Amino acid sequence: ATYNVKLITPEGEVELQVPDDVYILDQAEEDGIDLPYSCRAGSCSSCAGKVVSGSVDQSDQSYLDDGQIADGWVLTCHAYPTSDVVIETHKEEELT
């Protein structure tokens, strides 16, 4: 399947279609949309975002704890969409 992913960036909303087997960061980059990252391995805070609605699979990220996951935090470099999803990006500072 492929899902509608709305990214609310610091400079506005942009929508893109992300296959369920492509990481959200990776699709964004291919579609010309600059999101922050560092490790691209699921083990830092750089690519942090917060889910507004919808769901992702980020099993196999390691940095976020269950508290942070329960509060909607997502590492965009190691997250696949599992429904249409709305995600605020560039949220490291708020995490961190």
- Are 86 and 51 in contact by the 8 Å Cβ rule? The answer is yes
Could you say whether residue 80 binds ligand FES (CB under 6 A)?
Answer: no
Question: Does 13 show up as a binding residue in the annotation?
Answer: no
At 38, list the tokens: 């560092």
In whole angstroms, how close is the CB of 26 to ligand FES at the nearest point? 11
Question: Does 26 show up as a binding residue in the annotation?
Answer: no
Question: Does 7 show up as a binding residue in the annotation?
Answer: no
Could you say whether residue 77 binds ligand FES (CB under 6 A)?
Answer: yes
- DSSP, collapsed to helix, strand or coil, labels residue 21 as coil
In whole angstroms, how close is the CB of 24 to ligand FES at the nearest point? 10
Longest dimension (CA), the chain: 33
- Using alpha carbons only, give the angle 53, 57, 62 rounded to the nearest 5 degrees: 115
Question: Does 61 show up as a binding residue in the annotation?
Answer: no
Report the DSSP beta bridge partners of residue 3.
18
Could you say whether residue 63 binds ligand FES (CB under 6 A)?
Answer: yes
Q: Which residues bind ligand FES (CB under 6 A)?
A: 37-40, 42-44, 46-47, 63, 75, 77-78
